[PDB]
Amino acid sequence: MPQPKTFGELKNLPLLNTDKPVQALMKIADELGEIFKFEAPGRVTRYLSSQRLIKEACDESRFDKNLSQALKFVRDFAGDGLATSWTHEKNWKKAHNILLPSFSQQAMKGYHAMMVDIAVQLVQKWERLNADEHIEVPEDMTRLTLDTIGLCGFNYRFNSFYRDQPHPFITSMVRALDEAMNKLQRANPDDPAYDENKRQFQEDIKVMNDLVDKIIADRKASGEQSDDLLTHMLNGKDPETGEPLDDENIRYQIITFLIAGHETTSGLLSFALYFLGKNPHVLQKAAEEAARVLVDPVPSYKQVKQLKYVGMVLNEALRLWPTAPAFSLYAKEDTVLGGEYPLEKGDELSVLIPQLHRDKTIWGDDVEEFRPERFENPSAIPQHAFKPFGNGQRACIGQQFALHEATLVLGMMLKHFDFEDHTNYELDIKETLTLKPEGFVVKAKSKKIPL
Amino acid sequence: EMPQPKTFGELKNLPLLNTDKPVQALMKIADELGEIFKFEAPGRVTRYLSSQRLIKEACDESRFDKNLSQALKFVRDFAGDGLATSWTHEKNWKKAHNILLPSFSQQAMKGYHAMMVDIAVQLVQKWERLNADEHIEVPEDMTRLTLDTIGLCGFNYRFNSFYRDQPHPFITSMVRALDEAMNKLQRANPDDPAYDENKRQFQEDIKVMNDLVDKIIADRKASGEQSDDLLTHMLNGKDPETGEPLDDENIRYQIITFLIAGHETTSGLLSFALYFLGKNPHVLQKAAEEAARVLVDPVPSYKQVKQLKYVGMVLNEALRLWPTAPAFSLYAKEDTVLGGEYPLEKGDELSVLIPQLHRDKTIWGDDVEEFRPERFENPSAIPQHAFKPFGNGQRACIGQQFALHEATLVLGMMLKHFDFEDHTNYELDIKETLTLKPEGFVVKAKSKKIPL
Numbered sequence: 024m025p026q027p028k029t030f031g032e033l034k035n036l037p038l039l040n041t042d043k044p045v046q047a048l049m050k051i052a053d054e055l056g057e058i059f060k061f062e063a064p065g066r067v068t069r070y071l072s073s074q075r076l077i078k079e080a081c082d083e084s085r086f087d088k089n090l091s092q093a094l095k096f097v098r099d100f101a102g103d104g105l106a107t108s109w110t111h112e113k114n115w116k117k118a119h120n121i122l123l124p125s126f127s128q129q130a131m132k133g134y135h136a137m138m139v140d141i142a143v144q145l146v147q148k149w150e151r152l153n154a155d156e157h158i159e160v161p162e163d164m165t166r167l168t169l170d171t172i173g174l175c176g177f178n179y180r181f182n183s184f185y186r187d188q189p190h191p192f193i194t195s196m197v198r199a200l201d202e203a204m205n206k207l208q209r210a211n212p213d214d215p216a217y218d219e220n221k222r223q224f225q226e227d228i229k230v231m232n233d234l235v236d237k238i239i240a241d242r243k244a245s246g247e248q249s250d251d252l253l254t255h256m257l258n259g260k261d262p263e264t265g266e267p268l269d270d271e272n273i274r275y276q277i278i279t280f281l282i283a284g285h286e287t288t289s290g291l292l293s294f295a296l297y298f299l300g301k302n303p304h305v306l307q308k309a310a311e312e313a314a315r316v317l318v319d320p321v322p323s324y325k326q327v328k329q330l331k332y333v334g335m336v337l338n339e340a341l342r343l344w345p346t347a348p349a350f351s352l353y354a355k356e357d358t359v360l361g362g363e364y365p366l367e368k369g370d371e372l373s374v375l376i377p378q379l380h381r382d383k384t385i386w387g388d389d390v391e392e393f394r395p396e397r398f399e400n401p402s403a404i405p406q407h408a409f410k411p412f413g414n415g416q417r418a419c420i421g422q423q424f425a426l427h428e429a430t431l432v433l434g435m436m437l438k439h440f441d442f443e444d445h446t447n448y449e450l451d452i453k454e455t456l457t458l459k460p461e462g463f464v465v466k467a468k469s470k471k472i473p474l
Numbered sequence: 475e476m477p478q479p480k481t482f483g484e485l486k487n488l489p490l491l492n493t494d495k496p497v498q499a500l501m502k503i504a505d506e507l508g509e510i511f512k513f514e515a516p517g518r519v520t521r522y523l524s525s526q527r528l529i530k531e532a533c534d535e536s537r538f539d540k541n542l543s544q545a546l547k548f549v550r551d552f553a554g555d556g557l558a559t560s561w562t563h564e565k566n567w568k569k570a571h572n573i574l575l576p577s578f579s580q581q582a583m584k585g586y587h588a589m590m591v592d593i594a595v596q597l598v599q600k601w602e603r604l605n606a607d608e609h610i611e612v613p614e615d616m617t618r619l620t621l622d623t624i625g626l627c628g629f630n631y632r633f634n635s636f637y638r639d640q641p642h643p644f645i646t647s648m649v650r651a652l653d654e655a656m657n658k659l660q661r662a663n664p665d666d667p668a669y670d671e672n673k674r675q676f677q678e679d680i681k682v683m684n685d686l687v688d689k690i691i692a693d694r695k696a697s698g699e700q701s702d703d704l705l706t707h708m709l710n711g712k713d714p715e716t717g718e719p720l721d722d723e724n725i726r727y728q729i730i731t732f733l734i735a736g737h738e739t740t741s742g743l744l745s746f747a748l749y750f751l752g753k754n755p756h757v758l759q760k761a762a763e764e765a766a767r768v769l770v771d772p773v774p775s776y777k778q779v780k781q782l783k784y785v786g787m788v789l790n791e792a793l794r795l796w797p798t799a800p801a802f803s804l805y806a807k808e809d810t811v812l813g814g815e816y817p818l819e820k821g822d823e824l825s826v827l828i829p830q831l832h833r834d835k836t837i838w839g840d841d842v843e844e845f846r847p848e849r850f851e852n853p854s855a856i857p858q859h860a861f862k863p864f865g866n867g868q869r870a871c872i873g874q875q876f877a878l879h880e881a882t883l884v885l886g887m888m889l890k891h892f893d894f895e896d897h898t899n900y901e902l903d904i905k906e907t908l909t910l911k912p913e914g915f916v917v918k919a920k921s922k923k924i925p926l
């Protein structure tokens with residue numbers, strides 16, 4: 024098995040002590056090919072980049088989801104919510120079976136009006152800018168995604184478009200996430216220099232718990248029904264066990280939806296806008312469809328489904344820069360990968376999604392080009408070639424939500440504005456637990472079509 | 475011989491006005507001493523008038539003209555020779571007055587109505603989107619509304635106050651400049667080194683205001699675009715005599731002036747009206763009934779606002795009790811005798827104590843402290859010069875029709891869309907700056923769930 028340079032006891036870990044480790048790992052995959060071992064003190068994984076090997080890794084009879092160290096640190100505040108649970112934990116399957124119907128394509132009809140509410144706020148914000156002003160794209164997309172998941176998730180208004188400083192919940196959550204990510208690159212975590220970090224982390228957990236627990240207790244005392252995930256979780260019983268989720272787990276799911284959904288979806292929107300700005304022919308076609316389809320003052324659910332080319336633009340953005348760029352698996356039993364590489368029970372694999380998505384044997388030689396027409400016939404894409412939403416029963420439960428949100432909002436953005444890159448921005452991909460184009464800014468020129 | 479409260483050696487009457495609520499203190503002195511009293515401080519002197527009898531003489535423009543109070547003189551450092559801080563004799567006063575009058579008529583409000591609705595909808599949506607425990611800071615939100623409305627109607631510029639915690643830098647500088655000008659009134663040793671930073675900041679703030687407004691004027695002139703705003707009217711309007719428009723510098727001073735003169739007075743009014751409606755359930759029910767009956771469309775039309783008669787009366791009664799620009803100052807143009815009793819010399823100052831005028835029991839009856847909008851039901855029955863919240867004559871508020879159209883629209887919409895409750899049992903605290911407002915007034919709104 025190929026492997027990058029080791030540095031004594033540190034092994035390969037110094038190669039990930041960099042602001043952009045996924046990008047560095049893509050460069051290693053370029054050098055070493057479809058599979059390479061990566062060792063850190065007390066752990067080992069194997070990074071996979073080819074569809075050939077990844078299709079085996081996605082065999083659920085042979086491999087199951089592993090909790091990466093990142094996910095283990097996020098569990099300190101996401102608990103046994105869906106994303107940070109082992110498949111064999113009772114609350115994983117229970118929450119999965121209760122929630123799956125609230126996340127179907129059908130269920131998006133019920134969330135659509137709340138998604139529209141926030142999308143209109145975003146458009147109105149941009150319509151109201153003066154000639155001298157510009158848009159901070161990822162910052163505004165994140166205000167939108169957070170507010171949308173707040174409203175659809177538990178009928179709560181963070182009111183991000185009314186503030187300079189976010190709602191305290193948002194500040195704590197973002198800072199909690201940031202700390203969990205920082206712990207991955209922290210060699211002496213019990214050194215006194217991290218006492219303040221630990222104190223702040225605990226304060227932030229309490230801020231998130233107190234708000235979400237209060238909203239759950241308020242809802243239960245009032246008896247009111249809403250079109251939100253909270254109502255579904257309070258009323259739902261798991262078909263298998265016959266049991267509903269307990270209040271603590273419900274809190275963890277709410278926190279989980281916010282964490283799992285906000286930056287991934289924000290990143291996607293930002294990357295799509297960036298690529299449209301770089302590809303005028305693609306832009307013209309997307310904007311033509313938006314104008315033809317979105318004939319009403321606000322989009323209907325059905326109209327969003329008819330934005331086919333906008334959908335293709337978003338898939339092509341996820342091809343190039345899948346915003347949750349890696350997931351981790353373990354071997355359920357001893358097995359041989361690719362007819363060549365023996366693995367033992369418990370051995371870890373890591374899927375490098377951006378590298379999968381550039382497999383020339385699948386996509387052709389033009390893998391760096393932005394061409395949404397690649398997705399024109401989706402039944403022609405081989406199985407396990409395109410995995411921005413992970414795999415199998417542990418795939419993104421929020422896939423339909425994300426894509427409905429992104430299509431709606433991108434359609435509306437294209438219908439209402441022309442966008443200019445006033446700065447000749449050079450793409451800078453910031454890595455947190457997700458990917459986004461840092462510092463991406465534009466100016467909008469309104470088409471003056473009312474809402 | 476003129477009443478005067480007790481004097482204390484060189485300090486004169488100044489030890490009796492040791493307060494940041496001088497208008498309220500002066501009302502108590504008027505209660506004791508009556509319709510007219512002299513008030514001396516070291517190095518100044520004026521005569522406070524409280525009766526309609528005397529104030530009607532003071533409002534004789536052949537005998538008295540507007541005086542620039544010390545407050546107005548400090549405001550002139552950044553409002554320049556705009557309308558509010560000019561002497562009636564300054565060439566730019568008469569020139570600007572004649573150019574701008576048609577842009578402020580009742581008829582002209584038809585052209586501003588859509589922009590006023592735009593900001594009013596943003597206010598209503600902000601309140602609709604609050605979570606249940608949240609509350610409203612009334613004067614703060616009313617000021618966001620009035621500032622943004624004058625920005626949009628004045629020079630088609632969006633301060634976007636409902637998108638922010640910290641205001642647009644222009645607003646921050648303007649508010650801080652106003653605050654400094656007010657602070658100078660109570661400053662002994664103004665050239666002490668401890669005020670160097672104040673002076674530096676004041677100059678920075680003037681530059682911030684001038685640079686933005688000058689830029690917007692130059693942008694407008696380069697683009698050639700016409701708008702429904704005061705800036706378009708000032709660029710095109712010509713003085714009949716000279717054939718000239720206002721120059722670019724004066725246009726800037728008028729823009730700064732509209733913001734200063736209009737924002738807090740109108741915001742105060744709205745805030746006082748809401749406060750009084752909360753204290754008078756009978757009156758509230760009647761106002762809200764009219765709002766529901768009149769405002770039958772998803773947004774108000776201009777004609778509907780004109781039909782909000784009782785809402786208009788509520789606002790006039792709020793201006794009766796707490797006129798938000800509470801004083802104006804006059805000087806004697808020539809030697810003259812006031813009220814057949816009090817000789818005045820050329821240049822002598824009078825100050826109209828408007829809240830005290832508005833409590834003249836010989837005019838309004840004994841119930842002057844009650845909030846009764848029905849007092850205004852037949853406005854032809856109110857004696858001349860009895861009700862002056864917008865000042866007097868040619869130097870009266872040019873923005874009167876604007877203010878009242880704004881306030882009526884917004885109060886109608888507020889009553890249509892929400893019930894309000896005072897979750898704190900707030901005690902009225904009337905802060906005095908250049909204007910009056912109910913400081914700290916907070917409420918919770920319960921939506922009626924009527925869409926926009």
Ligand code: HEM
Nearest residue numbers: 105106283284287288291347350412413417419420421425
């Ligand atoms: C473009 C947007 C998004 C992308 C790219 C994305 C990607 C992913 C990926 C790759 C996984 C699997 C992770 C693993 O195997 O360890 C996942 C899981 C998950 N995602 Fe997303 N996601 C997106 C949006 C959302 C949204 C909007 C929500 C919720 C509203 C959400 C909720 C979840 C949840 C709950 C899981 C865990 C599911 C389970 O294991 O049962 N995601 N997502």
Ligand code: HEM
Nearest residue numbers: 557558735736739740743799802864865869871872873877
């Ligand atoms: C309830 C709201 C308002 C009240 C109570 C009010 C009151 C007054 C008063 C009492 C004066 C005379 C000051 C003096 O004699 O020294 C005045 C002048 C003025 N007001 Fe207002 N005002 C209001 C709203 C506005 C608005 C909205 C604007 C502009 C859009 C405005 C612009 C002016 C101007 C330019 C003057 C100076 C007029 C001149 O001397 O030629 N006011 N106002």
